[PDB]
């Protein structure tokens, strides 16, 4: 009937809804190719089902909030990889070895006093 | 160029020229004296003449003290010479196989 | 520069001694600390002493120095060069 | 010249601009927070003693 996963990356949270169908994908009231129009990284957001052959087998209802386009994109990758596992438990293997199931913890490291950024240090004359 | 700071103390342009002429002993070694900086100061027992100088082979840092300001200046140059002559020749030691 | 909605600023205590001189057959020398005051046309022809922090500088006002401030004509820093 | 300056900051001024903040605890003219009325030095002194309600050391 309907299948769901939760996808998060950096500061983006994507809610994805997998319903069976011909393959159409809509992200936040727009077609997929229109939301990421001109972004090379987009196609990676559909890789989990290309790994379990469900490329054209599903339609995609996708919401998206926070962060930026590529963070939102990687959030999708986890989301739809989340949904395919509840859609079928045996989808884990041949999806988990492809890493698609893990959540990417790499986030912005906080700015510290004394530095210019997280680690970039101010220039000085030791001489 | 060479900079001279008289910390919490006033000096003349003559005194500054004496310092420049005294630091000129370091020109002996024919190496670039890069942005040399002297700091003259007054402590309760005497004067302190500090210096920081970079050369292509390293840095020189030394402090001289004495009741007489010129002597403290001279003691500084002596400590700076011994360091420069170490920077200029220490590499020659490990030359034979 | 000052908003046009606001007025041409004069310290009023300087403007007063201008008109009393005008309305009586000026001039006496005016001493003042009103560097901020504009040189309004009623002042044209007087000679006014402007305080620069140390001295009151006699500044003869002419026709071509009107849209200006009194401080502009009694400069504050003594400088004669280096060497 | 500090005690007279501590009193002259309280006195309402001949012009609205001449008003400036001082430290209600030590009289410090610079780095005075308006929320506490304290300088950065007293802010840290009172906070460390627990006499600033709610204020805690922040780490993240």
């Amino acid at each position: 009937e309907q299948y769901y996963g939760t996808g998060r990356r950096k500061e983006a949270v994507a809610r994805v809804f997998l319903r069976p169908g011909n393959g159409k994908v809509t992200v936040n009231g727009q077609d997929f190719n229109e939301y990421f129009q001109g972004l090379v990284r987009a196609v990676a957001a559909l890789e989990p089902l290309r790994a379990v052959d469900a490329l054209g087998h599903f339609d995609a209802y996708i919401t998206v909030r926070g962060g930026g386009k590529s963070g939102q994109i990687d959030a999708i990758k986890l989301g739809i990889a989340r949904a395919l596992v509840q859609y079928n438990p045996d989808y884990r293997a041949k999806l988990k070895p492809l890493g698609f199931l893990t959540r990417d913890a790499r986030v912005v490291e906080r700015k510290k006093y004394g530095k210019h950024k997280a680690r970039r240090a101010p220039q000085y004359s030791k001489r | 160029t060479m900079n001279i700071t008289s910390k919490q103390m006033e000096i003349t342009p003559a005194i500054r020229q004496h310092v420049a002429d005294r630091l000129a002993k370091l020109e002996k070694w024919q190496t670039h004296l890069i942005n040399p900086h002297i700091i003259l100061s007054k402590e309760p027992q005497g004067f302190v003449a500090d210096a920081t100088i970079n050369t292509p082979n390293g840095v020189l840092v030394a402090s001289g003290k004495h009741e007489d300001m010129y002597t403290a200046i001279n003691e500084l140059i002596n400590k700076l010479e011994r360091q420069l002559n170490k920077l200029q020749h220490k590499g020659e030691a490990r030359r034979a196989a | 520069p000052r908003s046009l909605k606001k007025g041409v600023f004069v310290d009023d205590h300087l403007l007063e001694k201008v008109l009393e001189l005008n309305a009586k057959g000026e001039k006496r020398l005016i001493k003042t600390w009103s560097r901020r005051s504009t040189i309004v046309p009623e002042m044209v022809g007087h000679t006014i002493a402007v305080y620069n922090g140390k001295q009151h500088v006699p500044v003869y006002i002419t026709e071509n120095m009107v849209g200006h401030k009194l401080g502009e004509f009694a400069p504050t820093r003594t400088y004669r060069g280096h060497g | 010249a500090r005690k007279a300056l501590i009193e002259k900051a309280k006195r309402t001024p001949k012009f609205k601009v001449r008003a400036y903040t001082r430290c209600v605890r030590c009289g410090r003219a610079r780095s005075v927070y308006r929320f506490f009325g304290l300088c950065r030095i007293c802010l840290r002194e009172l906070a460390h003693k627990g006499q600033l309600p709610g204020v805690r050391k922040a780490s993240w």
Partner: protein, 97 residues
């Protein structure tokens, strides 16, 4: 029928939001549970040292925690034992409609 609670410590704030939810709950009738509004953080960054040492700071924060409760089915029976409300000192309550 709205009550919002603000406090600097969240332990007292939550306890003081339970003893309101619990209060008019059994007192009849409907109570919409304590909803934690996002916290407003007021930050304070100062130099640890009283003089220079600009690159060493200490961070302080003052968090103003927030809670909302809707006593949904009022019934002025509840509007009485709430008049005698034993709430701690750290929290502030607002009552609107």
């Amino acid at each position: 029928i709205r009550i919002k609670l603000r406090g600097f410590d969240h332990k007292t704030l939550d306890a003081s939001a339970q003893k309101i939810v619990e209060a008019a709950r059994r007192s009849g009738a409907q109570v919409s549970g304590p909803i934690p509004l996002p916290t407003r953080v007021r930050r304070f960054t100062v130099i640890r040292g009283p003089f220079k040492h600009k690159d060493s700071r200490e961070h302080f924060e003052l968090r103003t925690h927030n809670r909302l409760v809707d006593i949904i089915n009022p019934n002025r029976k509840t509007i009485e034992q709430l008049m005698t409300l034993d709430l701690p000192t750290g929290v502030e309550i607002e009552i609107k409609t």
